[PDB]
């Protein structure tokens, strides 16, 4: 059952029959060979993904599903900080609430409704047998049950060790089964002494048992609009991605422009970066942080364009207290961090490291 439900999810996950035109499965955009992200080229490069219709582009980068099962369900903590949830703006509560969405999203898999999804599941005798053994007879006859069952099978599948194996070098090193290179060890020291750790470590203090390099909080780090992705998405020149403020139920204008801190696990192989896939290279994502600390003019220029980073999409609610650390990362420290962030790659994606390198 705990195995069988994940097993059913495994099948759904790769089944393109869950898309309108049958071209697209979860695996299409969350490609297992690419740490569950989208290797496909669209009108905005790798920044945003193309739906089942073969034309529609999303407005956000497709995030890894690796370690997404470690994120807590979305909640407000006692200090008034929102934490957890799924999607960049935390608008899904958890994996199960997220799962049905790509399915019905006309920009993604674009099934017209629950009833069309159920009908798909029905046509396959393996589903009828797999679903019925877990959820009961006639489950596939009830669109609401079938759709929820599918979401739960998918959520259970993403919670398996296949998605969060913890077998990165970093893990191996924390187990004492090996050591960091000197560069890696310095990256690690920087990471934990500089401001990164104020957002990219599970805990404020103490040691986490299954660290995924995010505190699950929401921060506006002052990223500019990704012009090409925003063109591809068709959302308009006047459109503002309000991040967490777009979550239904969030009204507080202080949440405008804040996004979930992503896990750094497999960061090395899941470029391009940030919620709109604005930066292609890992080192560029790191350099971006120097714009709050460095006085050198170069710190204000995106190295990938040679132009200013650009005005923040949302100029208010910047995490200035954390971002303006009073210390700039020199290049030695940025190299050290890249090396440290690469130790975060799962074993099976270690071969992908060569091409990024």
């Amino acid at each position: 059952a705990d195995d069988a439900l994940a097993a059913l999810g495994a099948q759904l996950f790769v089944d393109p029959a869950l898309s309108r035109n049958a071209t697209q499965s979860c695996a299409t955009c969350h490609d297992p060979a690419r740490a569950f992200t989208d290797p496909r080229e669209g009108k905005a490069g790798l920044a945003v993904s193309v739906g089942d219709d073969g034309q529609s582009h999303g407005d956000r980068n497709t995030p890894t599903l690796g370690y997404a099962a470690l994120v807590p369900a979305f909640h407000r903590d006692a200090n008034g900080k929102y934490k957890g949830g799924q999607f960049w703006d935390g608008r899904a509560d958890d994996l199960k609430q997220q799962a049905g969405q790509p399915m019905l999203n006309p920009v993604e898999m674009a099934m017209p409704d629950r009833a069309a999804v159920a009908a798909r599941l029905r046509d396959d005798p393996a589903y009828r047998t797999g679903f019925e053994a877990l959820f009961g007879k006639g489950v596939l006859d009830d669109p609401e049950r079938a759709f929820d069952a599918a979401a739960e099978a998918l959520a259970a599948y993403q919670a398996t060790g296949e998605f969060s194996p913890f077998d990165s070098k970093y893990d191996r090193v924390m187990r004492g089964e090996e050591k960091f290179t000197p560069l890696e060890e310095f990256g690690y020291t920087v990471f934990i002494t500089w401001n990164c750790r104020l957002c990219h470590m599970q805990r404020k203090q103490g040691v986490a048992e299954r660290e995924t390099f995010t505190n699950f909080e929401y921060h506006n780090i002052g990223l500019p609009v990704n012009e090409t992705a925003r063109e591809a998405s068709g959302l308009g020149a006047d459109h503002v991605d309000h991040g967490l403020l777009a979550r239904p139920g969030i009204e507080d204008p202080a949440q405008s422009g804040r996004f979930k801190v992503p896990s750094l696990r497999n960061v090395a192989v899941t470029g391009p970066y940030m919620h709109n896939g604005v930066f292609t290279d890992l080192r560029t994502a790191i350099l971006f942080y120097n714009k709050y600390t460095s006085r050198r003019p170069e710190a204000k220029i995106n190295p990938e364009t040679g132009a200013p980073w650009g005005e923040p999409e949302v100029a208010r609610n910047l995490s200035l207290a954390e971002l303006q650390s009073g210390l700039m990362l020199d290049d030695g420290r940025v190299d050290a961090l890249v090396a440290f962030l690469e130790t975060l790659t799962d074993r099976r994606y270690e071969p992908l490291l060569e091409e990024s390198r």
Partner: protein
């Protein structure tokens, strides 16, 4: 038996074991209460100084406030704010002088007002708590100016502005009785009543001369604003108690702290804040020891406690330490605080018995002045 550092070690070990997460942050001091005690370190005339905020109950430092040269600390009896008149210089101890008043939130210790005092008008002197004083209403702060002549400055803490200087006769110390009046002690041996309008020469009334030319009243009389009791020792332990509630000075019978015998064997008051006054208990505490006539600023190893009404010795404590300054919490079952400048340590005593309960050491360089709120 477990010290505060030890209990802290254990709670920390347990949060680690349990994997408890907590956010590193800025603490708020515990709300001001009867047992809070403030120790001002005038630091032997150093140009910058510290005030320690101390939980008298746990004997724990719960915060600190920095001050300038010989700042005058004031503590609102109701616990709603602390303030000080302080003096800084643009180059440590030299250059442009700024006198100012700062008002602090008593839990975050953040400054809530910073009020420049024109024309560098503070009296710079070893700290006499009653050289700067809050009005009962807490809305005004009055500070003494010696130079070019005795004067009193009026600070509006409400509009956060300096108002003006009051011209007074040849007098010293400031004991506010009301939002527009305060008493001072004069050279001719009277007290002067100063009532200040919004404008004009304040109207100034002298009491009768109440002590001879060759009788010497200490720099640190105890004054209880809420009781209106001005308690004032002389060099010999003769204590003038003056009732100031009623808006005019009723002179209370004079009392003697030491026995006519004891003063024959050389018992005299001595130290800094030589006297404490507990309002509800109606008691005087006095630092005493055997000393020459002219060692009147030295530490004392003994405290005597006497009824403010009768003058009967209620106790004699051997403090066990060289104590320069005493004060008391004004709650019931008061602590008697006994500050040693030399040990830099606040010894916190039970005022009823005199048992040493706890102490907080490392209180600056030469702590001298103990202040407490009167909250009840």
């Amino acid at each position: 038996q477990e010290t505060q550092g030890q209990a802290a070690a254990r709670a920390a070990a347990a949060d680690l074991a349990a994997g408890q997460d907590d956010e590193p942050r800025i603490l708020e001091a515990p709300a001001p209460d009867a047992r809070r005690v403030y120790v001002n370190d005038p630091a032997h005339f150093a140009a910058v100084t510290q005030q320690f905020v101390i939980d008298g109950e746990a004997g724990r430092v719960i915060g600190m406030i920095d001050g300038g040269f010989l700042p005058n600390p004031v503590v609102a009896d109701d616990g709603s704010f602390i303030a000080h008149a302080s003096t800084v210089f643009s180059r440590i101890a030299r250059g442009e002088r700024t006198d100012y008043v700062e008002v602090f939130d008593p839990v975050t210790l953040l400054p809530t007002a910073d009020i420049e005092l024109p024309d560098a008008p503070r009296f710079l002197v070893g700290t006499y708590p009653w050289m700067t004083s809050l009005t009962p209403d807490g809305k005004t702060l009055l500070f003494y100016q010696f130079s070019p002549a005795p004067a009193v400055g009026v600070v509006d803490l409400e509009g956060k502005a300096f108002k003006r200087m009051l011209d007074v006769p040849d007098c010293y110390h400031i004991f506010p009785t009301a939002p527009d009046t305060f008493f001072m002690h004069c050279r001719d041996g009277s007290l002067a009543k100063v009532a200040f309008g919004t404008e004009g020469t304040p109207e100034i009334t002298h009491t009768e001369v109440f002590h001879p030319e060759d009788e010497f009243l200490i720099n640190h009389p105890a004054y209880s604003q809420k009781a209106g009791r001005l308690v004032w020792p002389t060099y010999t332990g003769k204590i003038h108690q003056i009732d100031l509630s009623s808006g005019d000075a009723k002179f209370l019978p004079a009392v003697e702290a030491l026995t006519e015998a004891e003063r024959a064997d050389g018992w005299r008051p001595g130290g800094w804040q030589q006297v404490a006054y507990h309002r509800a208990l109606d008691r005087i505490y006095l630092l005493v020891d055997q000393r020459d006539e002219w060692r009147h600023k030295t530490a004392s190893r003994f405290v005597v406690v006497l009824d403010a009404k009768t003058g009967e010795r209620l106790a004699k404590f051997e403090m066990g330490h060289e104590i320069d300054s005493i004060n008391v919490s004004q709650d019931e079952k008061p602590l008697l605080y006994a500050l040693s400048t030399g040990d830099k340590t606040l010894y916190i005593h039970d005022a009823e018995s005199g048992e040493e309960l706890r102490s907080v050491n490392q209180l600056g360089h030469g702590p001298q002045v103990i202040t407490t709120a009167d909250m009840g």
